[PDB]
């Protein structure tokens, strides 16, 4: 797991996955890929015209995702928003019910994969 120190410094996208009650950053090569069995936090840092940073926080919930994965993502989201002074706008993304905002981040492939890390409860 990574802290919030490496978060919203630079424009771009950061994606962690919930993995046994724990944020694990996603490899860049797998950005745009989501397991239907897992839950995710996504941070959109966009640079404004006046040079200031805008933040859009999305937790994303796989359709086959456990209640701990689900619950952890929503928690981290708040905790990280609080960290960024509550400057982020929070969105709940449910697989197959995502905002046009969230889908706009993924012009090429938004590719759903089957499976995912198992719940914390073994
Ligand atoms: Ca899972
Ligand atoms: Ca906020």
Q: Which residues contact 55 (CB under 8 A, 6 or more apart)?
A: 8, 43, 44, 45, 46, 84, 87, 88, 89
Question: Ligand 2 is a single-atom ion; what residues have CB below 5 A from it?
Answer: 81, 86
Is residue 59 within 8 A of residue 41, CB to CB? The reply is yes
Indicate the burial class of 33 (C-beta count within 10 angstroms; 0-12, 13-18, 19 or more).
Answer: middle
Resolution in A: 2.6
Rounded CA separation 21/70 (Å): 10
* Residue 12 is labelled as binding a ligand: no
16 Cα to the center of ligand 2, angstroms:
19
63 strand-pairing partners: none
* Residue 40 is labelled as binding a ligand: no
Rounded CA separation 79/112 (Å): 27
93 Cα to the center of ligand 1, angstroms:
16
Rounded CA separation 99/119 (Å): 26
Rounded CA separation 110/76 (Å): 23
Ligand closest to the CA atom of residue 121: 1
Give DSSP secondary structure letters for 35-96: ETT-EEEEEEEEE-TTS-EEEEEEEEE-TT--HHHHHHHHHHHHHHHHHTTT-SEEEEEETT
> DSSP letter at 101?
H
The dotted CATH code for 1-122 is 3.40.20.10
């Amino acid at each position: 797991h990574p802290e919030f120190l490496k978060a919203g410094k630079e424009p771009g996208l950061q994606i962690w996955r919930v993995e046994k009650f724990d944020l694990v950053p996603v490899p860049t090569n797998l950005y745009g890929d989501f397991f239907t069995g897992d839950a995710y936090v996504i941070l959109k840092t966009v640079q404004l015209r006046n040079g200031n940073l805008q933040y859009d926080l999305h937790y994303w919930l796989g359709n086959e995702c456990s209640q701990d994965e689900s619950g952890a993502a929503a928690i981290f989201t708040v905790q990280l928003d609080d960290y960024l002074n509550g400057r982020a706008v929070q969105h709940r993304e449910v697989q197959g019910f995502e905002s046009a905002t969230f889908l706009g981040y993924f012009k090429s492939g938004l590719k759903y994969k089957k499976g995912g890390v198992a719940s914390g409860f073994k």
